[PDB]
Design a protein around this ligand. Sequence first.
Ligand SMILES: Cc1ncc(COP(=O)(O)O)c(C=O)c1O
Ligand SMILES: Cc1ncc(COP(=O)(O)O)c(C=O)c1O
Lengths: 424, 422
Amino acid sequence: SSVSLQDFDAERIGLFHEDIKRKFDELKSKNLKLDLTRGKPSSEQLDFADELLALPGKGDFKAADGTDVRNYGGLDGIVDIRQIWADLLGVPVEQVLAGDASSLNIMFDVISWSYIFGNNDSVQPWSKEETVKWICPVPGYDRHFSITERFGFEMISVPMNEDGPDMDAVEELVKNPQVKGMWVVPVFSNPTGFTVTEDVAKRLSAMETAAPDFRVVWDNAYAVHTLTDEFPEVIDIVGLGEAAGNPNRFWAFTSTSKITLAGAGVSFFLTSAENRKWYTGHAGIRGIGPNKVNQLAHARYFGDAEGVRAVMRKHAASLAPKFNKVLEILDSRLAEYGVAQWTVPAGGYFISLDVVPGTASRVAELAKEAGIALTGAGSSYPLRQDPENKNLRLAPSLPPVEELEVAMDGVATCVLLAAAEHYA
Amino acid sequence: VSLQDFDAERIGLFHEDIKRKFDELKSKNLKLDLTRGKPSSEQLDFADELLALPGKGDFKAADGTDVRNYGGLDGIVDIRQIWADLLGVPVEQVLAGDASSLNIMFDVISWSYIFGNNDSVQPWSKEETVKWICPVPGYDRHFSITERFGFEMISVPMNEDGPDMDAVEELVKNPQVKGMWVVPVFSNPTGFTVTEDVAKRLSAMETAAPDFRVVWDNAYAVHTLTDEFPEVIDIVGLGEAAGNPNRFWAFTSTSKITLAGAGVSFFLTSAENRKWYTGHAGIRGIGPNKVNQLAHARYFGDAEGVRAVMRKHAASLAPKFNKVLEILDSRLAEYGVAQWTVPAGGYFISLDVVPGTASRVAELAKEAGIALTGAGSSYPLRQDPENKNLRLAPSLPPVEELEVAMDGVATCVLLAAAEHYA
Ligand SMILES: Cc1ncc(COP(=O)(O)O)c(C=O)c1O
Ligand SMILES: Cc1ncc(COP(=O)(O)O)c(C=O)c1O
C-alpha cells in the first residue's frame, strides 16, 4: 500500500514522470530568480551588531590589564575578549588566543607553517614528505578542503555520522604515518548539523597515531549557534587531549563571524601551551600582532559571556522560521515518495539533503533551468567529488521566508523530476 | 682637537672625568627607553574619532558593498581610491588588507617558498640555497623574516640615494638571489630616499632568477617631518615601462598614520602579481576586514585628509627630532666621535659611534637605565661588522624624557670612546 518511487512499477513511474514534468513546466513559467547558496547572515542579523560600528568609542582604548589598544604589541590578543570566550566556552583563559577577523586564516597558517617549518612535534617539515594524507569527514566544508587541496595533500574521506566522524575508520587510517591530520566541525557540523559526542571526542583524544606530529583541526565555528533556547555542550577538547596524554593533538578554532559581523569579527585559536608557543613564535615573525581595537570593540559590545548568549538568542529567532519553512516544504512535497533524506539540525547554518543517488547534479541543473541557484553537487566533498552524486547543501539564512517557500517548492519538484528520469 | 687625537695623558684625564659623570648618571636611577618605533599617545589621540567609525547605520562602500558581510579579496574601493590618489597611481594597482603590511610581506615570501610565485619554475623550498639582498642599516623585522626562512642574507650599503646599485646589479647575476628588501622613502633607520635614477636602475637591471622580487616597503611614504611631502615614485609603473612588470611588490600602511596595529595595509603590484596573490589569499580566507577600511575612508575623506593628518604628526615629531639633534650637537660634535643622520621624515636617527664601541655604548646605557636597541639590530643576523651603529627612536617619549635620555646616551658614547682610546 505504501510504495516508494524506486518501487513504482514501470508504467506507474512513466506516468509519474509525465505528471511531474507538467509541474516542472509550471515552475519554469514563474521566471524565478532565487538563490539558496549563500551561507552568510542576513541584513537583519547584521543589524543586531549596529552598535559595534561605533565601538569602542572615542576615549575608550584601555584593555582590562591597562594595554593601550591603539599602539603596537601583543601577539595573544587582549585579555578582555580572551576572558569572555574562556567563560563562554568553559575553558581556562590561558588556552585562548584571539586574532583578527578570520579563523580560516589561522587554520591556513598553522597548516602552512607545519608544511614549511614543521610543527613543534615534527621531526621534519611536511614539505619533505613524499605523500601527506589528510582525513576529511564528509559531507564537510568546502573551504577546509580547498586548503588541503591547495597544499597537495591526498584527502581521504570518512563518513560524518550523527555522533561525529566514523571512528573505526579514522582509527584505522591514522595507523599510516603519511596521515598528518584531519578536519572536523564538531558542533552543528557544516553541513550535516551533526555534533561530536563525548565518547567520540574521547576516542579522538586517546587514539594512537603513526605520525608523531598529527593534528586535529577542531573548527568549532558553530559553538554557540543554536536554533533553540538550549546551547550545545562545549567539550574542552584541548583538556581531553591533555588528560589522554596527547596534549598537542588539537588545534581548536572559533570566531564571531556569524555572531557580530561576517568578515569583521574576532577569531580564536585554542590549543595547548606548547602549541601556543610554537604559533606565537611564528606569528611574531609574520607581524607585530592582531588588531586589539576590534577586540576591545567586541568586548564592549558583549560585556560578558551572557551577552554573547543574548546575541545568539537574537540570531536563533531570526533563523528559526527560515529553517522551519525549508523543513516543512521538504516534508510536504517529498515525504510520501521516499526519494530524499534531509537533516533536521538544531543549530548551524545548513540543511543537508540527500536525493536519489546518481541525480544530485541533475537536480541542481533542473533548479538552474527554473531560476533557482543551488550549491553544486559535490561541493561538500574533497575535490568536489561526491562518489554517490546524492548530496546537496541548502543555506536558509539569507533570504526571506517567502522566497524560501517558493524556492524550496521548486527544488522539491526538481528532486522528483530527476528521480522520475532516473527510475523511468 | 678630536678625542682620537688626545695624547695618553689628556685622554686619561678625560676618561677619569667622564667615568665620574657616568657614575653620576647611573645614580639618577633612570628608567627611559629610546627603542620604540611607535607613535606617541599624543599622536594616537589624533585618531580618536576613528574609534567610533564608521558609526551606526554607515556600512556601505561607494560601490554599494555591505561592509558587514562576507566577501571581496581586494579591499573596498573607497580606501583603495584614497591611497591611489595619495600615491599618484592607478587604483587598479592597489589592494587593501588588514592592519599589518608585514603580514602581507611575510605571506608573499612564504607562498613563493611553498608554491613559487607566478614567474617561478619551482618553489623556493626546492632550492639548495636562497639568497636575499639586504641594504644596511635596515629594518630588523624584515631581516627576521628572511632569517626565519633560512635565506642567506647578503648585505649592501644603503646610501643617500638608495642601495648601492653597482653592488646590487652584480649580486642579482647569481640565480640563487631571489629578492631584496628596501624601504625607499625615509628609510628605516637611515632616513635615506631612493632617487628616480636608482629606481630606474632597479627596474631595468637584468636578474638571473626569473622570479626575482623587490620588496618596496614604502612604510614612510607620506611621513614628512617638515610638511614637504616626498616624491612617490610609481615603482610598479617603472617596472612595467622597463619590461619587468612583475618585479616589484610594493607596500604601505596606516600604522603610523592612524592606529599602530589597527590601521589598514596596502599591497601595490602588477596585474599578474595581484592575480597570483588573490588566488592564494582566497584559499587562506574569505577576505580582509572591510569595516575598518570604511572607518578609515570616512576618517580621511580624501587624500588631502591624509596629508592633513601627516601635518599633525610632523608638528608632534619634529621637535623631538630637533631636541635629539641638539643634544648630539652640543655633547658630541666637538669630539669627533660620532656621525648621525639628519632625516627629513620617518621615525629614526641612525647614529654611528667609534667603531668597536657600539655594543659597549648600549651596555653602558642599560646600566644607566636607558634602553637602546642593541648593536647590530639594523643588520642581518644582528651582525654589524664595524660595531658602530645604533638606532635612536625619538617618537614616543616626551621631549623632556628625550633630553634626559640623550644626555645620558652622550655620556655613554664618550665613556666608551675614552675606554677605546685609553
Ligand atoms: C566550518 C566553518 N569554519 C569557518 C568558517 C568561516 O569562519 P571565519 O570567518 O572565522 O574565517 C565557516 C563559515 O561560517 C564555517 O562554516
Ligand atoms: C619599514 C617598516 N615596514 C613596516 C613596518 C610595520 O608596518 P605594519 O604595522 O603595517 O606591519 C614598520 C614600522 O612602522 C617599518 O618601519
